[PDB]
Write a protein that binds this ligand. Structure first.
Ligand SMILES: [K+]
Ligand SMILES: [Mg+2]
Ligand SMILES: [Mg+2]
Length: 155
RNA sequence: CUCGCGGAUCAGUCACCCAAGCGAG
């Protein structure tokens, strides 16, 4: 199948639930989806964050499926707040360009399409961070549109 | 070169990748 990349950010508390004991959960997920998934090592954060990186390679549908499973795990946290309803994605600068559009018309449309709140990082690597927030179903739809833009691009 | 075994150290619900050492083409 036509393969695409999706890079998503993983809060440290969420990583163990993703990989699983012995790696059983991340292996089973790769098996079920066909996607290849690799995490950064534990203290290997994305510049400017406390978050590990998840590189996923697969069909569009696998990308979407794998993301949702990450979001489900992220939704479960309670160590003893805003981050439980966030998604963060790392996109190439050219696809961020496409996510934004002329005078920001595409991101407005993406937010109007979803019920999600979508931001990007300004211009501080040739990647930008896309932050999506809203309820689960809003975020999912937003993430679907974003993967659609990842798909629509000669990178 | 590449692959197979292996699994130092890191990690730690921590996999994949990656060291020593070994094997094969
Ligand atoms: K190996
Ligand atoms: Mg091995
Ligand atoms: Mg090896």
């Amino acid at each position: 199948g036509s393969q695409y990349f999706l890079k998503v950010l993983i809060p440290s508390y969420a990583a163990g639930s993703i990989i699983g004991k012995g790696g059983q959960t991340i292996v089973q997920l790769q098996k079920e989806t066909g996607a290849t998934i690799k995490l950064s090592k534990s203290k290997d954060f994305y510049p400017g964050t406390t978050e590990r990186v998840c590189l996923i390679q697969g069909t569009i549908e696998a990308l979407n499926a794998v993301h949702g499973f990450i979001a489900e795990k992220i939704r479960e946290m309670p160590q003893n707040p805003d981050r439980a309803n966030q998604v963060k994605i790392i996109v190439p600068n050219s696809t961020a360009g496409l996510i934004i559009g002329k005078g920001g018309a595409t991101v407005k449309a993406i937010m109007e399409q979803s019920g999600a709140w979508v931001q990007l990082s300004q211009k501080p690597l040739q990647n930008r961070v896309v932050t999506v927030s809203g309820e689960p179903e809003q975020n999912r739809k937003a993430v679907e549109l974003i993967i659609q833009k990842i798909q629509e691009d000669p990178q």
